[PDB]
């Protein structure tokens, strides 16, 4: 859960940077991929606890 | 116990499918970026490879 | 005066070479920027150069 | 004197281009600073530039 | 005037050494460029230098 929060904040930072315009779209896509990966990891951990 | 485990496994597989689809999209975007850079002249063949 | 003229011409040639390479870099970055493959900051930096 | 005036105007144009790129960079950093997404050291450095 | 001549000769030697190393780097990059193993940006930068 802590990792998910950190990754979400990182994704928000990258999205803001692209919105004002500082980085390419590849960084945004990579950040979104990382966020989806951490969400899947959170789901897996929840199922393991269950 | 087995039924519960199988249901949880199905849900986890769905989530992993979504994550891997997003990863594939990101990799495709990166490859297109590298190909465009190579066509312009700022990249070598090994980068697109 | 001939020596001074030669020195001035050499300085002009150096400046022209720098301008040429800067213009080439600007053209390449402008080509890459079309579909948002490089940051706008890099394009602005190249234009300033 | 015409040549000297032309040289001075060219130097002024160079300085103006540098100021323009610095101002654009600092404006983008100020826009980003609202959500605490950049350390204040970077913003101070951009303002000084 | 002899001292001034010596100073000018030393400056010329420094410039010649810089030109020699730049030319060597350019020749090596030109040999490498044949098989598209270096991006044209690096070759153009070396040529400008």
């Amino acid at each position: 859960q802590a990792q998910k929060e950190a990754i979400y904040r990182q994704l928000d930072q990258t999205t803001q940077r692209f919105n004002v315009g500082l980085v390419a779209i590849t960084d945004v896509q990579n950040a979104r991929a990382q966020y989806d990966t951490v969400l899947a990891n959170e789901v897996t951990a929840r199922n393991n606890l269950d | 116990q087995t039924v519960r485990s199988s249901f949880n496994n199905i849900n986890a597989s769905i989530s992993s499918i979504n994550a891997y689809k997003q990863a594939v999209v990101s990799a495709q975007s990166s490859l297109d970026a590298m190909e465009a850079g190579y066509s312009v002249g700022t990249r070598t063949i090994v980068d697109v490879l | 005066y001939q020596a001074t003229y030669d020195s001035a011409k050499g300085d002009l040639a150096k400046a022209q070479a720098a301008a040429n390479i800067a213009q080439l870099t600007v053209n390449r970055y402008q080509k890459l920027l079309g579909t948002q493959y490089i940051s706008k900051q890099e394009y602005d930096q190249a234009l300033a150069d």
Side-chain angles (χ1 to χ4, degrees), chain A, chain B, chain C:
Chain A
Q1 208 286 329
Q3 187 161 9
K4 177 224 266 202
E5 172 173 24
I7 295 302
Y8 178 54
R9 275 316 270 275
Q10 209 169 79
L11 161 71
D12 198 50
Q13 189 209 68
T14 298
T15 303
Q16 290 273 320
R17 286 242 267 278
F18 172 79
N19 249 21
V20 54
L22 279 165
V23 292
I25 197 156
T26 82
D27 294 5
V28 187
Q29 305 276 44
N30 164 63
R32 219 171 298 157
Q34 302 268 307
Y35 183 42
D36 285 4
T37 287
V38 77
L39 263 184
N41 283 2
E42 150 91 341
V43 152
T44 293
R46 215 179 281 258
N47 295 273
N48 269 325
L49 182 137
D50 174 40
Chain B
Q1 205 275 340
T2 289
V3 161
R4 248 79 177 248
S5 161
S6 293
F7 183 77
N8 294 314
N9 282 10
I10 277 285
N11 279 357
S13 70
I14 297 286
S15 289
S16 175
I17 276 298
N18 269 5
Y20 281 135
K21 187 156 83 201
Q22 184 41 243
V24 152
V25 156
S26 165
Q28 168 66 50
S29 303
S30 273
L31 162 80
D32 263 315
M34 278 308 220
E35 277 260 4
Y38 169 69
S39 87
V40 167
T42 53
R43 295 295 203 275
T44 85
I45 179 69
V46 86
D47 289 14
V48 317
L49 287 189
Chain C
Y1 299 108
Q2 199 65 42
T4 306
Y5 188 74
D6 294 322
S7 177
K9 255 197 158 311
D11 271 342
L12 164 68
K14 172 167 182 173
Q16 261 191 342
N20 185 27
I21 183 54
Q23 195 53 65
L24 272 196
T25 301
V26 163
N27 261 0
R28 281 175 191 143
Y29 279 176
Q30 190 254 343
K31 207 61 62 183
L32 274 185
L33 186 73
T35 86
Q36 301 125 293
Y37 274 133
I38 69 167
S39 152
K40 210 168 307 144
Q41 188 69 21
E42 280 83 299
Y43 183 71
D44 295 357
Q45 194 74 60
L47 212 57
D49 273 345

